[PDB]
Amino acid sequence: AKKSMINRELKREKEVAKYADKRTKLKETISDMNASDEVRMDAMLELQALPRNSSPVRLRNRCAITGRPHGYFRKFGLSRNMLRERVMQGDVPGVRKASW
Amino acid sequence: PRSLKKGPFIDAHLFAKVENALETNSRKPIKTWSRRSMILPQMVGLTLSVHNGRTHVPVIVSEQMVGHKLGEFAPTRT
Amino acid sequence: ARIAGVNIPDNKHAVISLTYIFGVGRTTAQKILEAVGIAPTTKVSQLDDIQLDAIRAQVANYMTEGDLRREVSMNIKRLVDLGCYRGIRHRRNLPVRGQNTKNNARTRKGPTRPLK
Amino acid sequence: PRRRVVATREILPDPKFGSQTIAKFINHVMSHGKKSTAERIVYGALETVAQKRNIEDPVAFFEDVLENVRPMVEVKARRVGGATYQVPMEVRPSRRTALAMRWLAEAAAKRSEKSMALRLAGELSDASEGKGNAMKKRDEVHRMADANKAFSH
Amino acid sequence: RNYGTGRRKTSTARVFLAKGTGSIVVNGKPLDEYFSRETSRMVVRQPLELLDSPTAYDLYITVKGGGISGQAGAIRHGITRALIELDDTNKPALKAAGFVTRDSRQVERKKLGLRKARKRPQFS
Amino acid sequence: QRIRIRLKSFDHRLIDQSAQEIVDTAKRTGAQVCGPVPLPTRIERFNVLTSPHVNKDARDQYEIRTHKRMVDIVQPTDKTVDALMKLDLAAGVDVQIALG
Amino acid sequence: GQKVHPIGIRLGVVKKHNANWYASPKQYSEYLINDIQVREYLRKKLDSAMISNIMIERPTGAAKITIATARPGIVIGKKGEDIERLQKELTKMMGVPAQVNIEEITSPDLDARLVADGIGSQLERRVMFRRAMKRAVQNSMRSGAKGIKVELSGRLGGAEIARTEWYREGRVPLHTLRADIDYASVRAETTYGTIGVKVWIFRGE
RNA sequence: UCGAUGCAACGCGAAGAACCUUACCUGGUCUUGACAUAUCUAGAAUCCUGCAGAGAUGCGGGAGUGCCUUCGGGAAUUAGAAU
RNA sequence: CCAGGGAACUCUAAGGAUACUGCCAGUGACAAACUGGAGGAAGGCGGGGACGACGUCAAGUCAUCAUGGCCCUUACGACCAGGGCUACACACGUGCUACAAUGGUAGGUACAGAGGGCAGCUACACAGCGAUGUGAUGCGAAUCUCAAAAAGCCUAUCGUAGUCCGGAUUGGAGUCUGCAACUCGACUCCAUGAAGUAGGAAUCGCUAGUAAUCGCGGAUCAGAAUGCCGCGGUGAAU
Numbered sequence A: 001a002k003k004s005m006i007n008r009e010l011k012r013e014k015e016v017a018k019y020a021d022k023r024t025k026l027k028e029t030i031s032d033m034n035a036s037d038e039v040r041m042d043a044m045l046e047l048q049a050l051p052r053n054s055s056p057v058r059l060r061n062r063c064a065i066t067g068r069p070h071g072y073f074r075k076f077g078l079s080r081n082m083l084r085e086r087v088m089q090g091d092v093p094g095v096r097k098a099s100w
Numbered sequence B: 001p002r003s004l005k006k007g008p009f010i011d012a013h014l015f016a017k018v019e020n021a022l023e024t025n026s027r028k029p030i031k032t033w034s035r036r037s038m039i040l041p042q043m044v045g046l047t048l049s050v051h052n053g054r055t056h057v058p059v060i061v062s063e064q065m066v067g068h069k070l071g072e073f074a075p076t077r078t
Numbered sequence C: 001a002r003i004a005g006v007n008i009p010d011n012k013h014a015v016i017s018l019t020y021i022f023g024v025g026r027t028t029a030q031k032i033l034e035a036v037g038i039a040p041t042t043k044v045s046q047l048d049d050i051q052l053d054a055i056r057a058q059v060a061n062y063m064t065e066g067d068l069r070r071e072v073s074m075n076i077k078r079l080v081d082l083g084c085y086r087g088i089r090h091r092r093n094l095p096v097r098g099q100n101t102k103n104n105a106r107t108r109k110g111p112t113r114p115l116k
Numbered sequence D: 001p002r003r004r005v006v007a008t009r010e011i012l013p014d015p016k017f018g019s020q021t022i023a024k025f026i027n028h029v030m031s032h033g034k035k036s037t038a039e040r041i042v043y044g045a046l047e048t049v050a051q052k053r054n055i056e057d058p059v060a061f062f063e064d065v066l067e068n069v070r071p072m073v074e075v076k077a078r079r080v081g082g083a084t085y086q087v088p089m090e091v092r093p094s095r096r097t098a099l100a101m102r103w104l105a106e107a108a109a110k111r112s113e114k115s116m117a118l119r120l121a122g123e124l125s126d127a128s129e130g131k132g133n134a135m136k137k138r139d140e141v142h143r144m145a146d147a148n149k150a151f152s153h
Numbered sequence E: 001r002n003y004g005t006g007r008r009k010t011s012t013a014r015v016f017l018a019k020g021t022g023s024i025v026v027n028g029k030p031l032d033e034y035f036s037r038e039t040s041r042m043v044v045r046q047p048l049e050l051l052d053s054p055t056a057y058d059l060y061i062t063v064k065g066g067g068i069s070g071q072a073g074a075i076r077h078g079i080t081r082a083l084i085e086l087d088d089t090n091k092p093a094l095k096a097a098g099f100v101t102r103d104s105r106q107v108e109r110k111k112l113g114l115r116k117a118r119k120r121p122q123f124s
Numbered sequence F: 001q002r003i004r005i006r007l008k009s010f011d012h013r014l015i016d017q018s019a020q021e022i023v024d025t026a027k028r029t030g031a032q033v034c035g036p037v038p039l040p041t042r043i044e045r046f047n048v049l050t051s052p053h054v055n056k057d058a059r060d061q062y063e064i065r066t067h068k069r070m071v072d073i074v075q076p077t078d079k080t081v082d083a084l085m086k087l088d089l090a091a092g093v094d095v096q097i098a099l100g
Numbered sequence G: 001g002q003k004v005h006p007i008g009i010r011l012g013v014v015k016k017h018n019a020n021w022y023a024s025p026k027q028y029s030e031y032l033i034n035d036i037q038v039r040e041y042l043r044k045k046l047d048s049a050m051i052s053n054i055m056i057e058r059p060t061g062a063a064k065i066t067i068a069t070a071r072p073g074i075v076i077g078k079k080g081e082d083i084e085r086l087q088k089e090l091t092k093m094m095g096v097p098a099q100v101n102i103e104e105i106t107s108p109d110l111d112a113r114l115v116a117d118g119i120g121s122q123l124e125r126r127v128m129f130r131r132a133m134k135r136a137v138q139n140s141m142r143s144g145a146k147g148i149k150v151e152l153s154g155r156l157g158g159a160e161i162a163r164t165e166w167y168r169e170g171r172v173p174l175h176t177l178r179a180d181i182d183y184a185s186v187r188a189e190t191t192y193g194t195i196g197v198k199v200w201i202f203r204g205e
Numbered sequence H: 001u002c003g004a005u006g007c008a009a010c011g012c013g014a015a016g017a018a019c020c021u022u023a024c025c026u027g028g029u030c031u032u033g034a035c036a037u038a039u040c041u042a043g044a045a046u047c048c049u050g051c052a053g054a055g056a057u058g059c060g061g062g063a064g065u066g067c068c069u070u071c072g073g074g075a076a077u078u079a080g081a082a083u
Numbered sequence I: 001c002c003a004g005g006g007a008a009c010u011c012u013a014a015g016g017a018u019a020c021u022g023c024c025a026g027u028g029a030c031a032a033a034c035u036g037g038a039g040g041a042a043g044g045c046g047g048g049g050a051c052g053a054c055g056u057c058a059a060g061u062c063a064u065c066a067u068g069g070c071c072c073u074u075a076c077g078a079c080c081a082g083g084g085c086u087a088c089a090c091a092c093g094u095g096c097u098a099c100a101a102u103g104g105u106a107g108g109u110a111c112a113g114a115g116g117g118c119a120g121c122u123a124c125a126c127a128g129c130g131a132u133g134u135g136a137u138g139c140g141a142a143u144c145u146c147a148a149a150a151a152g153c154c155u156a157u158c159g160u161a162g163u164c165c166g167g168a169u170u171g172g173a174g175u176c177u178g179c180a181a182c183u184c185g186a187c188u189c190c191a192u193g194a195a196g197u198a199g200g201a202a203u204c205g206c207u208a209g210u211a212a213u214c215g216c217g218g219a220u221c222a223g224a225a226u227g228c229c230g231c232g233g234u235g236a237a238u
Helices: A003-018 A020-031 A037-047 A080-089 B012-024 C014-020 C026-036 C049-059 C065-082 C085-091 D020-029 D035-053 D058-069 D093-108 D116-129 D133-148 E038-050 E070-086 E091-097 F012-025 F078-085 G025-045 G072-076 G078-092 G112-124 G129-142
Strands: B030-032 B047-051 B056-060 D073-075 D078-080 D083-085 D088-090 E002-007 E012-019 E024-026 E057-064 F004-009 F032-049 F059-075 F094-097 G051-057 G064-069 G100-104 G147-154 G163-170 G181-189 G194-202
Touching: A003 A020, A020 A037, A080 F032, A080 F059, B012 B030, C014 C026, C014 C049, C026 C049, C065 C085, D020 D035, D020 D058, D020 D093, D035 D058, D035 D116, D035 E038, D058 D093, D058 D116, D058 D133, D073 D133, D088 D133, D093 D116, D093 D133, D116 D133, E002 E070, E012 E070, E024 E038, E038 E070, E038 E091, E057 E070, E070 E091, F004 F012, F012 F032, F012 F059, G025 G051, G025 G064, G025 G078, G051 G112, G064 G072, G072 G078, G072 G100, G078 G100, G112 G129, G112 G147, G112 G181, G112 G194, G129 G147, G129 G163, G129 G194
Parallel strands: B030 B047, E024 E057, G064 G100
Antiparallel strands: B047 B056, D073 D088, D078 D083, E002 E012, E012 E057, F004 F059, F004 F094, F032 F059, G051 G064, G147 G163, G147 G194, G181 G194
């Protein structure tokens, strides 16, 4: 993809890790039954006041090499285009052509 | 629509804006781009202008519009 | 038998016949029979006046065809004069639940009309 | 096909009568790969006529009706220099039974009886004496076979 | 206590043949109770009656995998494998009946671009 | 003290030899060892489109098997243990220890 | 384009992956992404030397990268002065210190990548493609081989209409799985466009 | 938004558009710039904050002073100064 | 796994054996081959897949990537919010669900495979009509789980009706995911109950575990399959 779009994902993922611990502690606080009713809504209000990119929902995992937003594989982390190239050269361990 | 346990959603930058309008009881349009917010009973009677994508269409809040999103009344397509 | 102001088939089973009441479906029919205590398999024809009355009294709890047609009309009317998104879709006879309008909306737009 | 003659498959006989003719007829009634559903249709139909006509063994009765439906002469399509001659030819025995088994099922599927087992029972009874669409279909083929009776190429 | 291993499309059947009255027990339950299919019942009991000895041997079958008619074929194959143990003169008759051959038929795999093993996405 | 070794690789001919010396080095030290039982292998298949733009019917089928083996030292000895940390095997196969 | 990669179709029958590490599915991606990053860097920083096969097997923690070049003297340098500065650099972008060893290429003419790189270099230096293609065929056959196929695709000769020219000498039976064929597809960034260079080296079944 | 256009385009790229993805539009913004090397001025980076705004951003206050070499200082680092 | 703790069997997954027109009878140029027969699990290419010659279509891809040339550099580069890619007089291409009785509904009662699970699956208990909610447990898995397979079988019922078919649309009330479900999510419940009674000219797939039919998984994925890629069950006609 474009160079800006790759870098935009980096700064979109920088916030996710920066508020990673805050969300986890906040998430239990708003879901805690023993927490007071006014305690939990105030905390949930803060969750909606955090920076927008901080959530792990705006993350679109992307190919490491080319930055292709489509055809992504979690096991390999590469798009479909570059995974085929590396598999067929033999650079991906274990993976081979299948036939049954 | 939305879980009732999580409460009615209202934007942070809109809840304060309507709260400040209650004190003065002003009738001037309130310019907002957040049409995802729910309509509360505290904002009945005041006038605010929701983004339609191009401009800010003015909407006069009535009693029978509490419980809807602000975007209900800001058509986007023609 | 005549129940809730409209006649219903008498030869059919009680649970099936009660569905002919506009505003009463299969499970509402089942809930009605349980309160009175009549087996659903019993036909409407073999219903005594005492238990036919009991069904009529129980039907008053759930909204019948008369009131519900208004309320549905009022609910739809409430949107039309309101001017909301669902309001403009109802008046224009287009789907209101975010359904595909390019390809398939012929149950909401009526029969396909030829274009010159 | 175009080169060889593939061998025909072996069909196991029906479990209630041990005949490969009824088991093949069950294959002609079955749809969607539902063998058991077709079996009760055939068994119910055969039981209905057997219980009505007072016959102990219905496999021979089904042979009698099947032989009364099977055509002997069929009208093939032939071409001689662009001209289409509807030559009537004999029917190979494997095709005779297939045609008869086909017509019975297709004629019984358009009956007016309540159940399909009852619909098939009517056609089996009707075709036994020599009436019904199945008999009518066989006559129609024979009528066309007699209609030409002039191309012996 | 002759043993035979029966196999069909996905069901493997183990049979323990032994001289007795003729009772058949499949998975600790009677054959009629286990198999509601008359076809499956006949297929299971076919080799025994083929050579005129239905009520001669007691069977203890334990089936696994496959389906309701694949298990019947597996039991038939296993019963063949067990009958050939006591006597080698029955093997000609069972082979002529076609019960000694293990059916290699299997569900053909779905192919890419195809809708099934062979069905194609119709074009126009 | 019944230790159990667990082996997991992608290459199947790499674990057969890897387990072979483990069952040999643990049986040549005056100890009894049961052979490596093969456990069901995980076969992950993938459908990678070959073309960069069009014709979704052109794809490759890749697979990556994950074979697993394990052995049991039913009775261990001090001369069987001391032979086991010095058997430093890596680069292709992961070795797990129960230690008990 | 209708020919499968001859290395990937042989990956299990008569070949070996140039990667030998097991990682968990969570950890598999970051190893591979790290693994690919090594290849791109090492292919540019070590471009002067002629490197063909780089095997990257990482044991628990460490990583035993095994490059196979034809000029070890310039990769290693004086008493390994150049290899050591690469040691501290590869570790910086990887985990714990990873050792790098160099394998020797006895015949730097049977490797497809080495032959392809030479043809790619010659096309860069304004050499007629016909002579560059023919010579590499001659060298490979005279160096001991059973087949070479070299194919050049692009604007050969700086023409406007691209064309494919290929010279085969020997057997190179691509459809035989037990063939031991070395394949390489490199490029030549000329002044008139990229020229693709594909080399097949059949070296006995 | 764009591409795919007879078989061999049309559940095709897309193995999955609420935001993001997004490439299009309305508006609000930035100009060596989100990103790489050439550089010199201060500082460990980094963390927690206030207000104003739809947000991008803008203006302000507190804690910390790295590490190897040590008075040239160096792997990284925040805000420009210009080609 | 379970025949009698066992090391039998099934299973699991590595290494091998077998199959070679090898044997027989015939035809055939004293041939290659062909036709039948025995043995064997398998017979002549045993079934399926991968592998796609020289070239063709200046076929597709400059939007995976790279790249020659051309063009823009306070902008055709860059950031953000909202909209939009989801519009609808319409036509076309792929499908899915149906039009029912070989069926719908309500009770019982069976038989799989393959794959996933810490970026999670959830035993069990309780609350709930339900989606799901709280507590809590086992499991990086042949251990715990997804998960019950459905079609099937037995009983009752409906008795040919636009219906106890069909499930679009719409009204009301909710659960999850997520900063956020109006544009524009998926499910759950109640109510409504649309066309549709087998489809013109024309046209397509399939030769065997195939077609047809029935369910179950996975990738992508916070949530969002009637698509895609697979898995097995029943199982033809010619």
